[PDB]
Design an enzyme around this catalytic site. Structure first.
Site, mmCIF file in Angstrom:
data_model
loop_
_atom_site.group_PDB
_atom_site.id
_atom_site.type_symbol
_atom_site.label_atom_id
_atom_site.label_comp_id
_atom_site.label_asym_id
_atom_site.label_seq_id
_atom_site.Cartn_x
_atom_site.Cartn_y
_atom_site.Cartn_z
ATOM 1 C CE1 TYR A 1 -5.964 0.029 -18.803
ATOM 2 C CE2 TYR A 1 -7.323 -0.959 -17.058
ATOM 3 C CZ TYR A 1 -7.206 -0.355 -18.302
ATOM 4 O OH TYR A 1 -8.342 -0.142 -19.038
ATOM 5 C CB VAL A 2 -6.489 2.544 -12.361
ATOM 6 C CG1 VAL A 2 -7.516 2.552 -11.240
ATOM 7 C CG2 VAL A 2 -5.363 3.524 -12.052
ATOM 8 C CD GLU B 1 -12.855 19.898 -7.539
ATOM 9 O OE1 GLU B 1 -12.868 19.654 -8.768
ATOM 10 O OE2 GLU B 1 -12.594 21.034 -7.087
ATOM 11 C CG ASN C 1 -1.016 5.304 2.963
ATOM 12 O OD1 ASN C 1 -2.172 4.903 2.862
ATOM 13 N ND2 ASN C 1 -0.101 4.670 3.680
ATOM 14 C CB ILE D 1 -0.985 0.029 1.204
ATOM 15 C CG1 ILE D 1 -1.884 -1.219 1.213
ATOM 16 C CG2 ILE D 1 -1.846 1.297 1.188
ATOM 17 C CD1 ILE D 1 -2.447 -1.582 2.574
ATOM 18 N NE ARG E 1 1.037 3.420 -17.595
ATOM 19 C CZ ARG E 1 -0.287 3.549 -17.614
ATOM 20 N NH1 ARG E 1 -0.857 4.692 -17.986
ATOM 21 N NH2 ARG E 1 -1.053 2.538 -17.230
ATOM 22 C CG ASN F 1 -8.659 0.518 -22.602
ATOM 23 O OD1 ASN F 1 -8.041 0.130 -21.609
ATOM 24 N ND2 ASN F 1 -8.832 -0.245 -23.674
ATOM 25 C CE1 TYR F 2 -6.472 7.966 -19.184
ATOM 26 C CE2 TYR F 2 -4.860 7.681 -20.954
ATOM 27 C CZ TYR F 2 -5.159 7.931 -19.627
ATOM 28 O OH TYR F 2 -4.141 8.164 -18.741
ATOM 29 N N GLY G 1 -6.647 20.188 -6.962
ATOM 30 C CA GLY G 1 -8.083 20.445 -6.834
ATOM 31 C C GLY G 1 -8.923 19.371 -7.506
HETATM 32 N N1 LIG Z 1 -8.078 2.264 -16.041
HETATM 33 C C1 LIG Z 1 -7.008 2.661 -16.721
HETATM 34 N N2 LIG Z 1 -7.101 3.016 -18.018
HETATM 35 C C2 LIG Z 1 -6.036 3.414 -18.734
HETATM 36 N N3 LIG Z 1 -6.200 3.730 -20.034
HETATM 37 C C3 LIG Z 1 -5.165 4.136 -20.794
HETATM 38 C C4 LIG Z 1 -5.384 4.420 -22.148
HETATM 39 O O1 LIG Z 1 -6.492 4.211 -22.646
HETATM 40 N N4 LIG Z 1 -4.309 4.747 -22.888
HETATM 41 C C5 LIG Z 1 -4.416 5.037 -24.329
HETATM 42 C C6 LIG Z 1 -3.431 4.208 -25.164
HETATM 43 O O2 LIG Z 1 -3.234 4.503 -26.342
HETATM 44 N N5 LIG Z 1 -2.857 3.162 -24.534
HETATM 45 C C7 LIG Z 1 -1.838 2.300 -25.173
HETATM 46 C C8 LIG Z 1 -0.600 2.207 -24.249
HETATM 47 C C9 LIG Z 1 -0.891 1.506 -22.905
HETATM 48 C C10 LIG Z 1 -1.330 2.244 -21.797
HETATM 49 C C11 LIG Z 1 -1.587 1.598 -20.579
HETATM 50 C C12 LIG Z 1 -1.394 0.216 -20.464
HETATM 51 C C13 LIG Z 1 -0.945 -0.525 -21.563
HETATM 52 C C14 LIG Z 1 -0.692 0.122 -22.778
HETATM 53 C C15 LIG Z 1 -2.330 0.896 -25.597
HETATM 54 O O3 LIG Z 1 -1.622 0.218 -26.342
HETATM 55 N N6 LIG Z 1 -3.510 0.475 -25.101
HETATM 56 C C16 LIG Z 1 -4.058 -0.858 -25.445
HETATM 57 C C17 LIG Z 1 -5.071 -1.322 -24.399
HETATM 58 C C18 LIG Z 1 -4.327 -1.914 -23.205
HETATM 59 C C19 LIG Z 1 -5.328 -2.131 -22.080
HETATM 60 C C20 LIG Z 1 -4.619 -2.765 -20.892
HETATM 61 N N7 LIG Z 1 -5.655 -3.299 -19.999
HETATM 62 C C21 LIG Z 1 -5.410 -3.931 -18.843
HETATM 63 O O4 LIG Z 1 -4.254 -4.112 -18.448
HETATM 64 O O5 LIG Z 1 -6.484 -4.380 -18.133
HETATM 65 C C22 LIG Z 1 -6.227 -4.861 -16.812
HETATM 66 C C23 LIG Z 1 -7.553 -5.138 -16.109
HETATM 67 C C24 LIG Z 1 -7.672 -6.287 -15.324
HETATM 68 C C25 LIG Z 1 -8.875 -6.557 -14.670
HETATM 69 C C26 LIG Z 1 -9.953 -5.675 -14.795
HETATM 70 C C27 LIG Z 1 -9.837 -4.522 -15.578
HETATM 71 C C28 LIG Z 1 -8.632 -4.250 -16.235
HETATM 72 C C29 LIG Z 1 -4.723 -0.831 -26.828
HETATM 73 O O6 LIG Z 1 -5.339 0.207 -27.153
HETATM 74 O O7 LIG Z 1 -4.604 -1.859 -27.531
HETATM 75 C C30 LIG Z 1 -3.896 4.228 -20.203
HETATM 76 N N8 LIG Z 1 -3.720 3.899 -18.856
HETATM 77 C C31 LIG Z 1 -4.773 3.489 -18.126
HETATM 78 C C32 LIG Z 1 -4.651 3.138 -16.775
HETATM 79 O O8 LIG Z 1 -3.576 3.187 -16.181
HETATM 80 N N9 LIG Z 1 -5.777 2.723 -16.066
#
Ligand SMILES: Nc1nc2nc(C(=O)NCC(=O)N[C@@H](Cc3ccccc3)C(=O)N[C@@H](CCCCNC(=O)OCc3ccccc3)C(=O)O)cnc2c(=O)[nH]1
Length: 263
Positions: free
Chosen positions: A76-77, A142, A6, A4, A176, A118-119, A138
């Site tokens: 990844y969150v 929030e 904090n 953890i 990152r 994903n975004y 801020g």
């Molecule tokens: N929740 C979340 N969403 C996120 N979304 C993005 C995001 O959309 N980024 C836009 C992008 O173009 N991403 C690239 C680079 C990247 C970023 C982050 C991670 C890997 C790769 C990509 O190739 N992005 C890929 C999709 C990769 C998705 C990885 N997903 C995952 O590890 O799920 C774990 C899970 C387990 C259990 C429950 C629920 C989720 C694509 O577009 O092919 C980034 N970080 C995060 C993050 O850290 N947390």
């Protein structure tokens, strides 16, 4: 069992945020994998479940707490806990669905969202793109409150999605990229909230491609250039790992490192 870290937005300073991001990185990487001075996150393949996640406990001035779960393989969150309820994004595969059952095991209520995290999906639900969502202490303050109140109906889905977008960028993206951490440090230093500029957005979108290009490079030299953007939106070409050493702090594992080659 999972480590953890904090952080609180309450009286946050450049130093307290810096300490936080440093601690997150320390729990994400083992030190086993460093390529061209840039650390690589653990390989998902063969990674034991007891080493799969870290927990980020966020507190705010409103005396509320939420705990984010981060996948160590990519920062990844994957979901969050607020009190008696946990919420997970829709898993991308069966193995990841099993993996998240090891998170927040003592929680009374478990939910998996029907949507992925994903975004693109989060922006759709928010009704706003990253380029129009303000970041800073801020917004984070929030966001913590909004995550906390979701289970009781106090937070609408667009607000929740927006709040995730804030958390992801200020924690995972900052972890990152030293560059993105720097951009957040500046916002905290002056207590001024602002949406991320094109340099931030293009780095976020390119993290996977940059990771692969560096790891597949010939002695650091890219086979194909990668186009990024400056703060003013103008193009910047990346041909080599060298220019990225001050910019990228962690890479996702993409391939095995090549042998050293004796001269
Ligand atoms: N929740 C979340 N969403 C996120 N979304 C993005 C995001 O959309 N980024 C836009 C992008 O173009 N991403 C690239 C680079 C990247 C970023 C982050 C991670 C890997 C790769 C990509 O190739 N992005 C890929 C999709 C990769 C998705 C990885 N997903 C995952 O590890 O799920 C774990 C899970 C387990 C259990 C429950 C629920 C989720 C694509 O577009 O092919 C980034 N970080 C995060 C993050 O850290 N947390």
């Amino acid at each position: 069992q999972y480590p953890i870290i904090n952080f609180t937005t309450a009286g946050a300073t450049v130093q307290s945020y810096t300490n936080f991001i440093r601690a997150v990185r320390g729990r994400l990487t083992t030190g086993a994998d460093v390529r061209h001075e840039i650390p690589v996150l653990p390989n998902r393949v063969g990674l034991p479940i007891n080493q799969r996640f870290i927990l980020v406990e966020l507190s705010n001035h409103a005396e509320l707490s939420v705990t984010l779960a981060l996948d160590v393989t990519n920062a990844y969150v994957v979901g969050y806990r607020a009190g008696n309820s946990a919420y997970f994004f829709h898993p991308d595969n069966q193995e990841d669905a099993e993996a998240i059952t090891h998170l927040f095991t003592d929680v009374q209520n478990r939910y998996t969202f029907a949507f992925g995290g994903n975004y693109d999906r989060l922006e759709q639900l928010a009704g706003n793109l990253r380029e129009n969502i303000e970041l800073g202490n801020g917004p984070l303050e929030e966001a913590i409150s909004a995550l906390y109140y979701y289970s009781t109906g106090g937070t609408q889905l667009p607000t929740l999605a927006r709040s995730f977008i804030i958390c992801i960028q200020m924690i995972s993206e900052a972890a990152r990229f030293q560059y993105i951490e720097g951009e957040m440090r500046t916002r905290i230093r002056y207590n001024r909230r602002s949406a991320p500029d094109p340099s931030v957005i293009t780095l976020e979108n390119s993290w996977g491609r940059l990771s692969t290009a560096i790891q597949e490079s010939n002695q650091g030299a890219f086979a194909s250039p990668i186009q990024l953007q400056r703060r003013n939106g103008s193009k910047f070409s990346v041909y080599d790992v060298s220019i990225l050493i001050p910019i990228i702090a962690l890479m996702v594992y993409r391939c095995a490192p090549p042998p050293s080659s004796q001269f």
